[PDB]
Design a protein around this ligand. Structure first.
Ligand SMILES: *[C@@H]1O[C@H](CO)[C@@H](O)[C@H](O)[C@H]1NC(C)=O
Ligand SMILES: *[C@@H]1O[C@H](CO)[C@@H](O)[C@H](O)[C@H]1NC(C)=O
Ligand SMILES: *[C@@H]1O[C@H](CO)[C@@H](O)[C@H](O)[C@H]1NC(C)=O
Ligand SMILES: *[C@@H]1O[C@H](CO)[C@@H](O)[C@H](O)[C@H]1NC(C)=O
Ligand SMILES: [Fe+3]
Lengths: 639, 362, 181
């Protein structure tokens, strides 16, 4: 059978470590072939017997009015029979289901094009330098910030045996290759060679879009160990899985329009295709195609003034009847209609079930957004210009980065600033005192002591619902979390909204029997956003760490214990810069970037209890358990 | 326990989670306290019945709700239509569930529900009743448990012991009863009492309640599952429904009344047979023919009813009977369709989708 | 009913300088592949590194005897054939009692090369660890090795060494009851 890519990759890595160049080239080539073969098999038969069995639908069957229950039962039975037939076909095709799944690190190393690095090293060691330069160019295109591979490429170019046209890219997708080449040709004022490449780019774009939409029906994504508490019914699990699948299908338009050579996906890919096409067609002299392309562009953006001037100019040049008879292109119309229907469904799901969705298209008409959602976008636009005015007043009267992005109102009264960022010797730092009183501290202490030690807010609410922990403390925890979120948003002059990422109430117990010869630090100095190292003092914003977290906060509930301090450290993980003293109601708020490496000392006799909070600026990566927490809070206390 | 029960106006003093009440009842039972255990067990039974009734009311709407006709542009994409309807139904269910008092507590686990569906609390109930001078209630609970489980040795022993005691020989009442069972019992009694009109009225009353109960029980089986495998979209939503179908199939035979220790085979066919005979004895052909057609639909291999139908066909042009009066009743057609489809779907599913990685231990 | 075994691997244990016997495992290859394959490859040593001359480092009484690391003996090592770690596959089987093998992980989707033989019914581990075997024979050997003296860190004072490890092929997948032993 077709062996999995990761086993071959491991064998090739081991052979490379030992020093067997034939082994590493053989294993790497086999892995590269196997991955593509498996992907092609999945695509092929998924498409083939998704098209083999259509959904049919029964419009002729009119449900019985009086006998509603039987009509509903039959309407459910037909759909589930069709579903069972499709599932049976898929099981017949795919065969072994364990060969298609591999870890996240393996997908990462296949995205970074490491096998091409190994292959180029092996090919140079074997004296097959043509494949060596091909692999080196592929890796350099994949990773553009690598000086070494640039040096090897320059050496190969100077050393005799390499040709200019041999630089082929073995990994980039087709539809992007003719697009960039076509645009480069168009920039040199050569419209004879521009139209065929661009028309091809359109065709392979549509083909690749259709291929990519068929690889999205994947496994459902549970939040860690949340599949042990999953108690959804049939028609709820089906809709949750389909909503995730629809999100994955709509996220392909922003993946087809991105390149590693750029740090941001292209803006308005298909409309830009049509714009360049109509410019080139006007330059050549073909007028009917220019008018058609202008119309099929204005279909997407109907209020673009310049394109309207171009269309009117072409219509004046041509005849009225000709410019009336020709219309847009049908594929763009079908694409637009299907995308609009998908966006409507996703926006309804976001409005009702509170499942976040961010539009990947800038041509979406406002008529598809519900009225409830259009008011939340209106308020966040009002407060985006409100904040930008305050920064303007700060600068007009005036190290800037410590004044124009700090110093907030601190809305709630009874709250002061014990330390600002200057006394704390750093940027993006604050120490507030008195966010809560002593009653809150005692109540949260009782809540965490009764049942324990990371306890979330959703689990605390569930336990209060059952009857184990008090409900008032479980509501106070929620209220204090929201209050701290708003305080953090207000102090740092954030304009875009601040979302929730994770939060757990914890307690640390110092056992007095392991303390002997405990010279090592309890917790290493590190950073939250990336993975801090110990040699080059540089961190990588890579998937094995959480790269979406932006802001962090710690709130302390007591001060009756010894040790266990909180100290900020420089990148060297040695030089302590500033330390804080835990007390009741003290909050430490810092940005979770690489400029704030922190560490906690070792605790001694006593108890330490605190709430750790992490926030994101990305609506995609939000706390998926906060929606259910809000749902529980709404029905238990405000029915 | 079920005398002072009302779904709409429920006493708010006893609104506690089912698991907590069951745990308290078991703890008091192990502590040699009888009255408190009896009260807590009765409260738990009432809570379970309230949960079932709330589920039925929640599925009364939402599931049986017409869909407004969509726009013309959506008619070319069937998958979007189907799953948009599914999303609308799910949202309606989510809205409806939050309003009911029974759904604002802590929902019990699956093992507690499985225990309550096996009628197991009645063992403790009858023991505590007997240990508290409640002998008629004790024999009623023993009979109620033995109706569901006719193969228990110890329960048979206590039933034989109770029967020997004088006096408690007429209080054999099933505590978990249904309206259609009683209506059918009176219908059969009147039919044997050579009375036709009363039997006709009772049977025509009893049929719709049985259909309503059957459809509610079918709708109440689409529950949750334990996650133990992570597969694709279709392959993972085609196993939840396999389990749901396994649960759905038994609903026809779980609602069949049992008289004399033996369930009544071919319940609906029996109703239609009794109705046809009662209508025949009153010479009401206009209402007697469709019963014969329905019985032939259910029991295809029959003799006397086939000759009856042939005789009715021969004399069709004398009673003023048209050609469309020899068609089966719509409810019987719906029942037949919804049973045949389920059985065929299970037979198909248990050849291609069900994994073959288990064997019989020998 | 029950699951079908597909392959068998035998282990030879040496407590200190003495031998105890043989343990015969039965691994379910049709329910949990990509894990039985890892265990068999490590046991038979196709790629060199394997369980030969390995050690048991946790001999917790009444709970289990966990071992399987072969790079470093302190419990912070061990590798598989699929790189370093591979994800959890399916939690179809539970810890039904003594003698049920599983894959020890350090979180979620962090399966390595360390197993543990259970000795009591541990139902609180369900849904966290993947089960792929059952101790067919040599339960008394497991009982003998479980009771060795240990210090406070659960490490045995006397070394327990897997002297040999092979693979027995099975010509017919047969089911085994989902019970203890
Ligand atoms: C414009 O292009 C189309 C196809 O690209 C071609 O059929 C047509 O003849 C061209 N116009 C002229 C005037 O040749
Ligand atoms: C929590 O905040 C809400 C604000 O809507 C308030 O109504 C409620 O009384 C608060 N409860 C506690 C325990 O602070
Ligand atoms: C279902 O709920 C709706 C509430 O929107 C209500 O109007 C309707 O009457 C309910 N269904 C039945 C059968 O009562
Ligand atoms: C229901 O009745 C029978 C079932 O065998 C068959 O005609 C079909 O499934 C249904 N009838 C119609 C008219 O669809
Ligand atoms: Fe941290």
């Amino acid at each position: 059978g077709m062996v999995t890519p990761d086993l071959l990759f491991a064998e090739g890595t081991a052979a490379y470590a030992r020093g067997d160049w034939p082994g590493v080239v053989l294993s790497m080539e086999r892995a590269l072939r196997s991955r593509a073969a498996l992907r092609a098999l999945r695509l092929r038969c998924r498409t083939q017997c998704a098209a083999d069995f259509p959904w049919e639908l029964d419009p002729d069957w009119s449900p019985s009015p009086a006998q509603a229950s039987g009509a509903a039962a039959l309407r459910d039975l037909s759909f589930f029979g069709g579903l069972l037939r499709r599932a049976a076909c898929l099981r017949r095709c795919l065969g072994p289901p364990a060969a298609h799944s591999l870890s996240e690190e393996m997908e990462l190393e296949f995205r970074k094009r490491s096998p091409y690095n190994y292959l180029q090293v092996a090919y140079f060691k074997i004296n097959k330098l043509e494949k060596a330069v091909a692999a080196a160019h592929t890796f350099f295109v994949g990773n553009p910030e690598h000086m070494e591979m640039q040096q090897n490429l320059d050496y190969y170019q100077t050393m005799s045996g390499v040709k200019e046209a041999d630089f082929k890219d073995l990994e980039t997708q087709p539809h992007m290759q003719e697009f960039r080449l076509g645009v480069r040709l168009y920039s040199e004022e050569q419209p004879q060679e521009a139209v065929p490449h661009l028309e091809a780019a359109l065709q392979e774009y549509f083909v690749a879009y259709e291929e990519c939409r068929a690889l999205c029906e994947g496994p459902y994504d549970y939040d860690g160990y949340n599949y042990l508490e999953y108690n959804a019914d049939l028609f709820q699990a089906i809709t949750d899985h389909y909503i995730q699948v629809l999100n994955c299908k709509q996220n392909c338009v922003t993946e087809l329009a991105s390149h590693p050579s750029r740090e941001k996906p292209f803006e308005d890919f298909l409309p830009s295709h049509y714009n360049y096409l109509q410019f080139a067609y006007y330059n050549i002299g073909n007028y009917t195609q220019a008018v058609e392309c202008a119309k099929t562009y204005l279909l997407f953006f109907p209020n673009d003034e310049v394109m309207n001037q171009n269309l009117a100019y072409y219509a004046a040049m041509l005849g009225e009847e000709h410019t009336r008879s020709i219309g847009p292109r049908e594929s763009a119309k079908e694409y637009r209609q299907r995308s609009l229907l998908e966006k409507e469904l996703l926006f309804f799901a976001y409005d009702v079930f509170g499942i976040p969705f961010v539009d990947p298209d800038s041509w979406t008409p406002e008529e598809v957004i519900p009225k409830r959602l259009q008011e939340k976008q209106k308020s966040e636009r009002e407060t985006a210009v409100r904040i930008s005015q305050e920064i303007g007043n700060l600068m007009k009267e005036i190290d800037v980065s410590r004044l124009t992005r700090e110093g907030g109102p601190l809305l709630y009264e009874g709250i002061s600033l014990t330390m600002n960022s200057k006394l704390l010797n750093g940027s993006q730092r604050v120490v507030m005192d008195g966010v809560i009183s002593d009653h809150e501290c005692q109540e949260l202490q009782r809540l965490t002591n009764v049942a324990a030690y990371g306890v979330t807010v959703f689990k605390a609410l569930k336990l209060g619902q059952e009857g184990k922990v008090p409900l008032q403390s479980a509501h106070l925890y929620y209220n204090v979390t929201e209050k701290v979120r708003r305080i953090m948003e207000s102090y740092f002059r954030l304009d875009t909204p601040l979302y929730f990422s994770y939060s757990h109430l914890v307690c640390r117990t110092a056992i007095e029997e392991v303390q002997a010869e405990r010279k090592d630090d309890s917790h290493p100095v590190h950073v939250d956003n990336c993975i801090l190292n110990a040699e080059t003092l540089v961190c990588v914003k890579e998937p094995p760490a959480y790269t979406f977290r932006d802001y962090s906060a710690i709130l302390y509930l007591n001060g009756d214990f010894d040790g266990g301090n909180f100290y900020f450290t420089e990148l060297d993980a040695k030089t302590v810069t500033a330390e804080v003293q835990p007390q009741c109601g003290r909050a430490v708020g810092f940005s979770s970037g690489t400029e704030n490496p922190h560490g906690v000392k070792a605790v001694t006799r006593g108890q330490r209890c605190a709430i750790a909070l992490w926030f994101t600026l990305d609506p995609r990566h939000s706390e998926r358990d906060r929606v259910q927490a809000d749902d529980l809070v709404k029905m238990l206390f405000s029915p | 326990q079920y005398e002072r029960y009302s779904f709409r106006s429920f006493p708010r003093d006893e609104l506690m989670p089912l698991e907590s009440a069951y745990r308290h009842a078991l703890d008091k039972y192990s502590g040699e306290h009888w009255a408190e255990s009896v009260g807590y067990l009765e409260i738990s039974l009432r809570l379970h019945r309230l949960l079932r009734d709330s589920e039925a009311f929640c599925h009364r709407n939402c599931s049986a709700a017409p869909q407004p006709e969509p726009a013309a542009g959506l008619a070319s994409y069937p998958e979007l239509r189907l799953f948009g309807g599914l999303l609308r139904r799910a949202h309606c269910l989510k809205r409806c569930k939050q309003g009911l008092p029974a759904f604002r507590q802590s929902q019990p686990s699956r093992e507690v529900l499985a225990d309550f569906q096996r009628r197991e609390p009645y063992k403790f109930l009858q023991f505590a009743y007997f240990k508290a001078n409640n002998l008629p209630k004790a024999i009623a609970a023993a009979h109620t448990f033995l109706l569901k489980h006719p193969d228990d040795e110890m329960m048979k022993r206590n039933m034989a012991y109770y029967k020997s005691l004088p006096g408690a020989e007429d209080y054999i009442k099933d505590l978990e009863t249904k309206s259609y069972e009683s209506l059918f019992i009176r219908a059969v009694r009147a039919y044997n009492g050579e009375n036709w009109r009363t039997s006709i009225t009772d049977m025509e009353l009893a049929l719709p309640d049985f259909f309503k109960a059957f459809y509610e029980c079918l709708a109440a089986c689409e529950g949750s599952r334990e996650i133990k495998d992570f597969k694709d979209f279709y392959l993972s939503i085609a196993d939840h429904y396999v389990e749901v179908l396994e649960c759905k199939i038994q609903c026809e035979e779980n609602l069949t009344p049992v008289i004399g220790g033996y369930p009544v085979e071919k319940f609906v066919a029996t109703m239609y047979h009794y109705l046809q005979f009662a209508y025949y004895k009153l010479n009401d052909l206009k209402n007697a023919a469709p019963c014969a057609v329905s019985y032939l639909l259910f029991d295809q291999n029959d003799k006397v009813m086939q000759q009856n139908l042939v005789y009715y066909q021969y004399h069709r042009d004398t009673w003023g009977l048209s050609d469309e009066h020899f068609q089966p009743r719509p409810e019987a057609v719906q029942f037949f369709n919804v049973t045949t489809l389920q059985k065929e779907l299970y037979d198909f599913a248990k050849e291609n989708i069900m994994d073959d990685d288990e064997g019989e231990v020998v | 009913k029950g699951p079908k075994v597909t392959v068998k691997v035998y282990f030879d244990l040496r407590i200190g300088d003495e031998d105890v016997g043989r343990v015969i495992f039965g691994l379910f290859g049709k329910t949990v592949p990509k894990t039985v394959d890892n265990f068999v490859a490590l046991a038979t040593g196709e790629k060199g590194f394997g369980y030969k001359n390995s050690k048991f480092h946790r001999v917790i009484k009444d709970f289990m005897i966990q071992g399987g690391d072969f790079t470093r003996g302190d419990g912070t090592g061990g590798k598989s054939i699929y790189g370093e770690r591979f994800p959890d596959e399916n939690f179809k089987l539970k810890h039904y009692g003594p003698g049920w093998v599983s894959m020890a992980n350090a979180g979620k989707d962090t399966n390595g090369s360390q197993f543990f033989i259970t000795t009591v019914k541990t139902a609180w581990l369900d849904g966290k660890h993947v089960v792929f075997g059952k101790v067919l024979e040599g339960m008394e050997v497991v009982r003998k090795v479980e009771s060795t003296k240990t210090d406070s860190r659960d490490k045995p004072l006397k070394d327990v060494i897997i002297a040999d490890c092979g693979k027995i092929e099975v010509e017919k997948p047969f089911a085994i009851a989902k019970e203890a032993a």
